[PDB]
Design an enzyme around this catalytic site. Structure first.
Site, PDB file in Angstrom:
ATOM      1  N   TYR A  44       0.728  -1.264   0.000  1.00  0.00           N
ATOM      2  CA  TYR A  44       0.000   0.000   0.000  1.00  0.00           C
ATOM      3  C   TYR A  44       0.758   1.317   0.000  1.00  0.00           C
ATOM      4  O   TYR A  44       0.104   2.357  -0.084  1.00  0.00           O
ATOM      5  CB  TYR A  44      -0.977   0.057   1.198  1.00  0.00           C
ATOM      6  CG  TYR A  44      -1.983  -1.093   1.352  1.00  0.00           C
ATOM      7  CD1 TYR A  44      -2.785  -1.531   0.292  1.00  0.00           C
ATOM      8  CD2 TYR A  44      -2.113  -1.707   2.600  1.00  0.00           C
ATOM      9  CE1 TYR A  44      -3.709  -2.576   0.475  1.00  0.00           C
ATOM     10  CE2 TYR A  44      -3.032  -2.750   2.793  1.00  0.00           C
ATOM     11  CZ  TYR A  44      -3.825  -3.180   1.727  1.00  0.00           C
ATOM     12  OH  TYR A  44      -4.737  -4.213   1.926  1.00  0.00           O
ATOM     13  N   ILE A  48     -11.785  13.095   2.197  1.00  0.00           N
ATOM     14  CA  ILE A  48     -11.250  13.036   0.832  1.00  0.00           C
ATOM     15  C   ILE A  48      -9.974  13.893   0.643  1.00  0.00           C
ATOM     16  O   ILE A  48      -8.954  13.440   0.048  1.00  0.00           O
ATOM     17  CB  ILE A  48     -12.384  13.481  -0.128  1.00  0.00           C
ATOM     18  CG1 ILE A  48     -13.432  12.370  -0.145  1.00  0.00           C
ATOM     19  CG2 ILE A  48     -11.865  13.777  -1.530  1.00  0.00           C
ATOM     20  CD1 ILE A  48     -14.653  12.783  -0.950  1.00  0.00           C
ATOM     21  N   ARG A  87      -8.806  -3.851  -7.981  1.00  0.00           N
ATOM     22  CA  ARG A  87      -9.540  -3.569  -6.768  1.00  0.00           C
ATOM     23  C   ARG A  87      -8.955  -2.219  -6.340  1.00  0.00           C
ATOM     24  O   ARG A  87      -7.760  -2.080  -6.055  1.00  0.00           O
ATOM     25  CB  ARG A  87      -9.273  -4.630  -5.725  1.00  0.00           C
ATOM     26  CG  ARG A  87     -10.225  -4.531  -4.512  1.00  0.00           C
ATOM     27  CD  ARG A  87     -10.011  -3.417  -3.496  1.00  0.00           C
ATOM     28  NE  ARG A  87      -8.718  -3.584  -2.870  1.00  0.00           N
ATOM     29  CZ  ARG A  87      -8.387  -3.023  -1.707  1.00  0.00           C
ATOM     30  NH1 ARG A  87      -9.231  -2.260  -1.027  1.00  0.00           N
ATOM     31  NH2 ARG A  87      -7.192  -3.281  -1.197  1.00  0.00           N
ATOM     32  N   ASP A 100      -8.431   0.695  -3.822  1.00  0.00           N
ATOM     33  CA  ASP A 100      -8.342   0.999  -2.422  1.00  0.00           C
ATOM     34  C   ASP A 100      -8.904   2.390  -2.126  1.00  0.00           C
ATOM     35  O   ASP A 100      -8.653   3.327  -2.886  1.00  0.00           O
ATOM     36  CB  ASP A 100      -6.870   0.931  -2.018  1.00  0.00           C
ATOM     37  CG  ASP A 100      -6.520   1.439  -0.622  1.00  0.00           C
ATOM     38  OD1 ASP A 100      -6.863   0.770   0.363  1.00  0.00           O
ATOM     39  OD2 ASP A 100      -5.909   2.511  -0.537  1.00  0.00           O
ATOM     40  N   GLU A 137     -13.284  -0.588  -2.387  1.00  0.00           N
ATOM     41  CA  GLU A 137     -13.596  -0.822  -0.990  1.00  0.00           C
ATOM     42  C   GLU A 137     -14.120   0.431  -0.329  1.00  0.00           C
ATOM     43  O   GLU A 137     -13.399   1.447  -0.288  1.00  0.00           O
ATOM     44  CB  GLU A 137     -12.371  -1.280  -0.214  1.00  0.00           C
ATOM     45  CG  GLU A 137     -12.687  -1.632   1.252  1.00  0.00           C
ATOM     46  CD  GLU A 137     -11.552  -2.242   2.060  1.00  0.00           C
ATOM     47  OE1 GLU A 137     -10.382  -2.193   1.666  1.00  0.00           O
ATOM     48  OE2 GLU A 137     -11.848  -2.790   3.118  1.00  0.00           O
ATOM     49  N   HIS A 143      -8.861  -8.663   4.591  1.00  0.00           N
ATOM     50  CA  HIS A 143      -7.790  -7.923   5.239  1.00  0.00           C
ATOM     51  C   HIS A 143      -8.168  -6.852   6.267  1.00  0.00           C
ATOM     52  O   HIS A 143      -7.316  -6.410   7.038  1.00  0.00           O
ATOM     53  CB  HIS A 143      -6.961  -7.323   4.118  1.00  0.00           C
ATOM     54  CG  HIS A 143      -7.786  -6.410   3.233  1.00  0.00           C
ATOM     55  ND1 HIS A 143      -8.856  -6.642   2.482  1.00  0.00           N
ATOM     56  CD2 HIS A 143      -7.565  -5.067   3.222  1.00  0.00           C
ATOM     57  CE1 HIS A 143      -9.290  -5.486   2.047  1.00  0.00           C
ATOM     58  NE2 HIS A 143      -8.499  -4.553   2.498  1.00  0.00           N
ATOM     59  N   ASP A 144      -9.421  -6.392   6.300  1.00  0.00           N
ATOM     60  CA  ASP A 144      -9.843  -5.348   7.227  1.00  0.00           C
ATOM     61  C   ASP A 144     -10.756  -5.821   8.333  1.00  0.00           C
ATOM     62  O   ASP A 144     -11.434  -5.045   8.991  1.00  0.00           O
ATOM     63  CB  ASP A 144     -10.533  -4.229   6.442  1.00  0.00           C
ATOM     64  CG  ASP A 144      -9.535  -3.239   5.833  1.00  0.00           C
ATOM     65  OD1 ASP A 144      -8.372  -3.207   6.227  1.00  0.00           O
ATOM     66  OD2 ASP A 144      -9.906  -2.467   4.958  1.00  0.00           O
TER      67      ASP A 144
HETATM   68 CA   LIG Z   1      -7.723  11.616  -0.720  1.00  0.00          CA
END
Ligand SMILES: [Ca+2]
Ligand SMILES: [Ca+2]
Length: 686
Positions: free
Chosen positions: A100, A190, A227, A229, A257, A327-328
């Site tokens: 990540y 955001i 996918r 993130d 996700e 994973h979460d």
């Molecule tokens: Ca952002």
């Protein structure tokens, strides 16, 4: 080619995904292992690299561990080069083992392998009919402090080895510098940084173009799915132009996700799945499956209500990726949990609607709490666990039984602890009976199904104590006792004579793009595809066979259309709605309006003369716009996907309840750029 082919990159309902943390699966090449403080070969410090790589996944495809299970898609860690720093967060050392913390989205993470190892993974997976989904995390680079340039790699972004910039002394504004989110609002989450991750600024043209060039490169290397993130932490408007870039270039299945907690239902979540261009990880399914099968905090009526409600709330329910852990989340299996609970939840997920994803190690009964304890190295590659046999028997039915891949879900019998549901597509049927009570037998009386008469054998072979179902006249089953913990699957397949559409992908693209329509009963002879009342025939139909049609989108105006198929005999299918034809290529423009004071509950919106802006309809206006972080009230702002290279007309408006107040004056005009981003900064016209 058929709907079930490995070359169908657009739709995955016939697949079963196996989610792999690359570092924790198999170390096939020890020479590429990180050294020193970054590496722990015993994998007891779960924040370090344990050594797992792409050669390890290739070995497990080749030797039959993954294919023996019936897996047809693997979801792997983000493949791009990550930072090399070992970060000490209050004593504990941390590495980028998870993929990540990107630093170059155009190169590979060498611990996972080289570009040639990535290519060998694609080719090995495809040669074994396995599709490859990669994580892609365009929201951020890596941990950074603008105050301390020496912390980690200062969030620096490189473009194939050329440094673009860092978080300290960011004169080009590649990143956001607004502080860290407290998650109070979607706007806050955001534009502010997630924890200490350097937030990429997508309104910067260099960042916008770079990320779009980067995803195209990975599409060029043959990936079959993406996918994404942290979709809740990037502007919706930008992500819609990002999906447009993929779909107008080489459309592949994309899902994001957006986390939901237990019993949380979010309108913004459903709006994202329905209008962004990508589907979502189905947290609504997952949290309720865990309440009914794991935690006993809800019963079968809660399960029934989620299944029935999600069929309506998601415009395309067959595109949502379902799971019981990932994973979460804490692993589903607990230390004192009965293994049958995991075995049933896996059976439920594999026979339900959507695209099932199994988290690596589920079949080996791994237990573990939250991050990083849910990411331990796989302990065993035993192919004889009951969980391995359950997936091995049920995962093939996704390719062989269209009722499982595409069908509706119908509750046929229920009580607090038992559900029997039927999946139906044409005359294909699957019926699943689950008794979650581990102590009490259930007496089933009065079960009626769509099965033809016969003596159906349990597809699980009795391993979860299922039984044979005797169906008499009119689909009526002979009465039976479902064992404590019993789970059985009965099915019937045959040909569809009528066209039935089970899935369409992509669902948003410009005229000229070939889309994929999967289903049954299309027939061998080329027929007609309808986009609304517009018929597409002949040469614009790129391929036609009984389970799949590929057809170019007609040059119709931008907007939302129903898709319908007529076979060569003129027999027509069900309507597959909500397909969005774009006006053209997309760019994200930031609209900023000053001096727009509002009342309580009154917000500012944007609309204009193209479908992307709602075609002048207040009910479909863009917004409510934002007004706290990048600009502050009474200035409002929003990032919107609009057609590229075009003069659009627009006006701002305020809405409060049913009352719409339009700006006065002439309509505004703006000529959009062909690529990159642009900012419109205007003043409310009374
Ligand atoms: Ca952002
Ligand atoms: Ca290795």
């Amino acid at each position: 080619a058929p709907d079930t082919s490995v070359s169908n990159k657009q739709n995955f309902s016939t697949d079963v995904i196996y989610q792999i943390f690359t570092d924790r699966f198999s170390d096939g090449n020890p020479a590429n292992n990180p050294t020193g403080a970054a590496f722990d070969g015993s994998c007891t410090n779960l924040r370090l690299y344990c050594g797992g790589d792409w050669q390890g996944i290739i070995n497990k495809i080749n030797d039959g561990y993954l294919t023996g299970m019936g897996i047809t898609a693997i979801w792997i860690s983000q493949p791009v080069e990550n930072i090399y720093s070992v970060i000490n967060y209050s004593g504990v050392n941390n590495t980028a083992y998870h993929g990540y913390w990107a630093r170059d989205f155009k190169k590979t993470n060498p611990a996972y392998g080289t570009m040639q190892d990535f290519k060998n993974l694609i080719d090995t997976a495809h040669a074994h009919n396995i599709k490859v989904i990669i994580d892609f995390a365009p929201n951020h680079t890596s941990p950074a402090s603008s105050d301390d340039p020496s912390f980690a790699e200062n969030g620096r972004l490189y473009d194939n080895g050329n440094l673009l910039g860092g978080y300290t002394n960011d004169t080009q504004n590649l990143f956001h510098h607004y502080g860290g989110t407290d998650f109070s609002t979607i706007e806050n989450g955001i534009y502010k940084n997630l924890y200490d991750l350097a937030d990429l600024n997508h309104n910067n043209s260099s960042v916008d173009v770079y990320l779009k060039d980067a995803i195209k490169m990975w599409l060029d290397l043959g990936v079959d799915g993406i996918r994404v993130d942290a979709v809740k932490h990037m502007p919706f408007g930008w992500q819609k132009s990002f999906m447009a870039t993929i779909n107008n270039y080489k459309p592949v299945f994309t899902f994001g996700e957006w986390f939901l907690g237990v019993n949380e239902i979010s309108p913004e979540y459903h709006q994202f799945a329905n209008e962004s261009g990508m589907s979502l990880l189905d947290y609504r399914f997952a949290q309720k499956a865990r309440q009914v099968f794991r935690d006993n905090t809800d019963n079968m009526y809660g399960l029934k209500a989620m299944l029935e409600g999600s069929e309506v709330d998601y415009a395309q329910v067959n595109d949502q990726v379902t799971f019981i852990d990932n994973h979460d989340m804490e692993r589903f299996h607990t230390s004192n949990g009965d293994r049958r609970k995991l075995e049933q939840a896996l059976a439920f997920t594999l026979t339900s609607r959507g695209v099932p994803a199994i988290y690596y190690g589920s079949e080996q009964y791994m237990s573990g709490g939250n991050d990083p304890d849910n990411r331990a190295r796989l302990p065993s590659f035993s192919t004889t666990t009951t969980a391995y046999q359950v997936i091995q028997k049920l995962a093939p039915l996704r390719k062989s039984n269209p009722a499982i891949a595409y069908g509706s879900t119908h509750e046929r019998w229920i009580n607090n602890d038992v559900i029997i549901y039927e999946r139906k597509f044409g005359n294909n049927v699957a019926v699943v009976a689950i008794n979650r009570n581990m102590n009490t037998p259930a007496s089933i009386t009065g079960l009626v199904t769509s099965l033809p008469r016969g003596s159906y054998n349990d597809v699980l072979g009795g391993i979860l104590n299922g039984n044979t179902l005797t169906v008499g006249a009119g689909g009526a089953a002979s009465n039976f006792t479902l064992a404590p913990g019993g789970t059985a699957v009965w099915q019937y397949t045959t040909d569809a004579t009528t066209p039935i559409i089970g899935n369409v992908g992509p669902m948003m693209a410009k005229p000229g793009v070939t889309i994929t329509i999967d289903g049954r009963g299309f027939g061998s002879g080329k027929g007609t595809v309808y986009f609304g009342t517009t018929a597409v025939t002949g040469a614009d139909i790129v391929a036609w066979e009984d389970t799949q049609i590929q057809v170019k989108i007609p040059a119709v105006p931008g907007g939302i259309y129903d898709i319908r198929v007529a076979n060569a005999a003129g027999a027509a299918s069900n309507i597959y709605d909500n397909f969005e034809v774009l006006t053209g290529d997309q760019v994200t423009v930031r609209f900023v309006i000053n001096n727009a004071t509002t009342a309580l509950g009154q917000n500012v919106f944007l609309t204009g003369n193209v479908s992307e802006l709602g075609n002048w309809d207040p009910n479909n206006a863009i917004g409510p716009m934002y007004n706290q972080v990048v600009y502050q009230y009474p200035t409002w702002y929003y990032d919107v996907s609009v057609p590229a290279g075009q003069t659009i007309e627009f006006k701002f408006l305020k809405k409060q309840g049913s009352t719409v107040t339009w700006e006065g004056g002439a309509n505004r005009t703006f000529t959009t750029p062909t690529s990159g981003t642009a900012t419109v900064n205007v003043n409310w016209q009374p």
